[PDB]
Ligand binder design. Structure first.
Ligand code: A1CK6
Ligand code: A1CK6
Ligand code: A1CK6
Ligand code: A1CK6
Lengths: 121, 122, 121, 122
């Protein structure tokens, strides 16, 4: 019934988001992996007037991995599309950049892919 | 966060206007020199508000959805990178641009690249 | 029983490969998608002495999309790992670069992910 | 293919020695300035042997597995990019470096980046 809701990726991370009428994404992310505990703030944007031809809805969001419990000195962005239907899905690719010195900046950024559904593990 | 807050440009001639809040928020507007884009677009992101002090960059990311009250490309970009302070401040990024597609075309939905931003003097 | 064999990705593309003893990958690729028909030459490398701790086997390969039938003026590289087991798998991330002018070089490279098994569709 | 064939360097100080064959093959050796690497490693790749003549680059890619008779990092890099000819010839790339990992650690297996190669004069 839309982007707003509670989503889970293939690792069991929990993505709770609200899609504002004019394109805002606002919520929290709890990661099952990495140097992370509890919830982290997220913010992003989505296409609030998608095509009407069967295409998905483009979107993206960011988390910086600092909260009251931990600071990993890193940030992830997810870029992807929402696909509506009986089992709604958000398919993404992500970039996780850690703060580095300039000379190790070559090993600063991990890449991967996450797919989200509203099915709770 | 004084360092990040300001006006920036990338190697394509795009410009990025941003304000870094005490809570880790990035807000502002983006004007792209390339692609299916005109005028300013809203951006929103996050940064590490308590970075290391050991000669590391400050991790940050932001998103633009390419819809404004003038044009809609049905697409969104995220930039992931780090701010490097000092007199010649830079934001070094890699980005992902996803277009809305049909399922059969999803394999060709996402472009990747890298942008370098240089800060300019208010 | 190893990297050598016939593999299929989630799109139904066919990847036929031989893993040489000292690290070569040599074979053909037939793509179910894009500006492609029939087989294309591939070449790559893999770790011919992987860790013995349960880790996967790192690898990569390239196809340039020119054969006797078509030339798309593009090339893909896949980077990933082989995971042995009862349903062996190769998990990859890929980059597809098209030849462009310098000023459109910003839109030259697509990214995605392919997972391969030996199960024929 | 005279253009591609030769010695190249990237912005990290790594060097790439390559021979472009008539059949579309790339062969050679790579010496990395960074990471868990020493001495030369085999590379192998492909390029478009009949590129456009319309002022486009020539698409190419190659792979190195980081095992040689001296060291083994249990990892591999692929570079995907284009050759831009002329007097100041360049190869502009983006790359993926995958390390062998356990299944539980596969989420952190792959680094991404970009390398610029400049040709040097035999
Ligand atoms: O370890 C660190 O630097 C901090 C935590 C990184 C967490 C990531 S990993 C990719 C993305 N998807 C997911 O479920 N979590 C995030
Ligand atoms: O055409 C579309 O879908 C909409 C416009 C995309 C713009 C992008 S391209 C990479 C990034 N860097 C920059 O200066 N602009 C953004
Ligand atoms: O259209 C073009 O430029 C030429 C053909 C590109 C084919 C690709 S798309 C990603 C990769 N995986 C797969 O099954 N095929 C390849
Ligand atoms: O540490 C390891 O796993 C083995 C060594 C990795 C080397 C890489 S890093 C990006 C690419 N560019 C370059 O000059 N070298 C390669």
């Amino acid at each position: 019934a839309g982007i707003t809701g509670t989503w889970y990726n293939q690792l069991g991370s929990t993505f709770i988001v609200t899609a504002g009428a004019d394109g805002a994404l606002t919520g929290t992310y709890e990661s099952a992996v990495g140097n992370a505990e509890s919830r982290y703030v997220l913010t992003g944007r989505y296409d609030s007037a998608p095509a009407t031809d069967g295409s998905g809805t483009a979107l993206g969001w960011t988390v910086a991995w600092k909260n009251n419990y931990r600071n990993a000195h890193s940030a992830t962005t997810w870029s992807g599309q929402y696909v509506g239907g009986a089992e709604a899905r958000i398919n993404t690719q992500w970039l996780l950049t850690s703060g580095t010195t300039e000379a190790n900046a070559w090993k600063s950024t991990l890449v991967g892919h996450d797919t989200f559904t509203k099915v709770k593990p």
